[PDB]
Amino acid sequence: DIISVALKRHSTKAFDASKKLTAEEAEKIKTLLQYSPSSTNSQPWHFIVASTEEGKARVAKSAAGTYVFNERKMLDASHVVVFCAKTAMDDAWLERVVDQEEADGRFNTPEAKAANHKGRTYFADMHRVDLKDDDQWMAKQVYLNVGNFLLGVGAMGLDAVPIEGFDAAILDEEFGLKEKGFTSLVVVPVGHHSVEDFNATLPKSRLPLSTIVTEC
Amino acid sequence: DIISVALKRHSTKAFDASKKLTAEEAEKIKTLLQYSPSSTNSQPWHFIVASTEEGKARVAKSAAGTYVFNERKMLDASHVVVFCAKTAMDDAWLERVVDQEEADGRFNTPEAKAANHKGRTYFADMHRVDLKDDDQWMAKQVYLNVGNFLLGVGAMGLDAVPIEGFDAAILDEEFGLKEKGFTSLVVVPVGHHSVEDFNATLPKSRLPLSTIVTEC
Numbered sequence: 001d002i003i004s005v006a007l008k009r010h011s012t013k014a015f016d017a018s019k020k021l022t023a024e025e026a027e028k029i030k031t032l033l034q035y036s037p038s039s040t041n042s043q044p045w046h047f048i049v050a051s052t053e054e055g056k057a058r059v060a061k062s063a064a065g066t067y068v069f070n071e072r073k074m075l076d077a078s079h080v081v082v083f084c085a086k087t088a089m090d091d092a093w094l095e096r097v098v099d100q101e102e103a104d105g106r107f108n109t110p111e112a113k114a115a116n117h118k119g120r121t122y123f124a125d126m127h128r129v130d131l132k133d134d135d136q137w138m139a140k141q142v143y144l145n146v147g148n149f150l151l152g153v154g155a156m157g158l159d160a161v162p163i164e165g166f167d168a169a170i171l172d173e174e175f176g177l178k179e180k181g182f183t184s185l186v187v188v189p190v191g192h193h194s195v196e197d198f199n200a201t202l203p204k205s206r207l208p209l210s211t212i213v214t215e216c
Numbered sequence: 217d218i219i220s221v222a223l224k225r226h227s228t229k230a231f232d233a234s235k236k237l238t239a240e241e242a243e244k245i246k247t248l249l250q251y252s253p254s255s256t257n258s259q260p261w262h263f264i265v266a267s268t269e270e271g272k273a274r275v276a277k278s279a280a281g282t283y284v285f286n287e288r289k290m291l292d293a294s295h296v297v298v299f300c301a302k303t304a305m306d307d308a309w310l311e312r313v314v315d316q317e318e319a320d321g322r323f324n325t326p327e328a329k330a331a332n333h334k335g336r337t338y339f340a341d342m343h344r345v346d347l348k349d350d351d352q353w354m355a356k357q358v359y360l361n362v363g364n365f366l367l368g369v370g371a372m373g374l375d376a377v378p379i380e381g382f383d384a385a386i387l388d389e390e391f392g393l394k395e396k397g398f399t400s401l402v403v404v405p406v407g408h409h410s411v412e413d414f415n416a417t418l419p420k421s422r423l424p425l426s427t428i429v430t431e432c
């Protein structure tokens with residue numbers, strides 16, 4: 001039951017460094033990243049999936065200063081995913097999306113492709129020109145991807161912890177993201193929690209429905 | 217198989233106006249909204265769940281002019297969820313979160329609660345004071361909730377479609393969100409697609425892993 005998953009998944013505070021994702025699970029988490037939906041299927045993202053010791057250590061460099069409390073999570077987890085957003089929406093990328101959809105057979109007629117291109121252009125330009133906030137818009141799509149991912153790995157029986165407690169400037173420089181047109185937003189270590197994960201047994205806590213929901 | 221769900225769920229283009237969620241399903245989608253994770257468990261959100269014809273009509277007011285092509289999805293679906301984010305992070309809310317966590321038994325000592333409070337305050341101020349982007353920070357938590365939600369309803373065998381194509385100013389006015397300290401971000405109609413929902417049969421399309429993923 002997916003609801004049981006939602007009620008039982010938790011942010012792992014300590015991973016068992018000896019437990020690695022199986023080959024199949026490693027392939028599956030990549031599929032989750034890839035198939036998340038996004039506005040106009042813009043997929044304005046890039047992911048760094050670190051599973052080697054050096055790779056994880058490089059990501060862990062971002063857990064400096066007061067963020068050191070997140071260092072071990074990055075080092076001990078099996079796979080560490082760095083969620084990145086594009087820094088600017090370029091036409092090349094927009095054409096890429098529609099050309100891929102065409103290649104995937106989503107358009108039965110040329111008019112179907114044109115309507116899809118027109119729609120994407122509308123939203124892309126609204127953010128790139130009218131509101132000048134495509135950076136924020138794309139980052140929001142990335143966070144949506146994170147939400148999809150956390151529940152997905154949870155449903156797979158895998159543990160993880162979403163992390164905002166890291167220095168993105170440091171992480172960006174470490175992987176030369178800026179030059180590639182990306183910037184890091186969330187780091188998500190994935191693996192299996194150890195018995196020393198105090199958060200594995202604490203009850204989950206959320207404000208009451210009477211406060212967060214309005215029915216009409 | 218959550219991966220099969222990710223490969224099969226789709227953005228519903230048409231809903232069967234006669235198929236409603238069961239009472240149990242209605243309770244479950246609300247649980248999904250409530251239990252989504254968030255930075256510091258800040259839960260900077262509110263949700264409008266319209267299930268009555270009048271309720272959906274009010275939300276559909278936002279599907280005006282340019283967005284009229286999204287009106288029927290909002291009217292024919294069983295339940296329509298409007299994801300809202302807080303417009304500013306006030307101390308009052310941060311207090312609510314920590315007090316709820318204490319009530320739920322997440323702290324072993326008063327010192328533990330204070331430590332949790334200070335930590336949350338640190339992240340909160342980083343956005344409210346330093347970066348002056350707490351509005352965007354919270355909106356990102358909402359999108360993450362949206363991501364969690366879409367996969368969840370998909371895993372429930374339910375159909376839904378995320379909608380950015382609506383006028384938030386109109387929606388905000390209609391539900392007096394501004395006054396409540398909230399703003400509408402995404403509308404998600406939930407229900408059962410109709411036989412006319414062509415997007416249910418079109419193949420899914422995403423860019424290749426060789427482009428979006430870097431393994432290290």
Ligand SMILES: Cc1cc2nc3c(=O)[nH]c(=O)nc-3n(C[C@H](O)[C@H](O)[C@H](O)COP(=O)(O)O)c2cc1C
Pocket residue numbers: 009010011013070161162163164165166186204251252253254255256257360
């Ligand atoms: C975007 C985001 C960033 C977060 N950052 C951190 C972090 O830096 N370190 C950490 O241990 N937990 C972090 N958390 C975990 C939150 O404290 C957690 O999601 C919340 O308290 C609810 O608990 P749950 O995830 O167990 O359901 C983050 C969560 C989100 C959604």
Ligand SMILES: Cc1cc2nc3c(=O)[nH]c(=O)nc-3n(C[C@H](O)[C@H](O)[C@H](O)COP(=O)(O)O)c2cc1C
Pocket residue numbers: 035036037038039040041144225226227229286377378379380381382402420
């Ligand atoms: C934030 C967001 C906003 C979206 N807005 C709309 C919309 O206004 N109308 C619509 O029909 N689809 C909308 N979509 C659906 C996208 O076109 C869709 O998610 C994407 O093309 C991938 O297809 P899939 O969801 O079927 O996997 C939206 C998706 C997201 C994630």
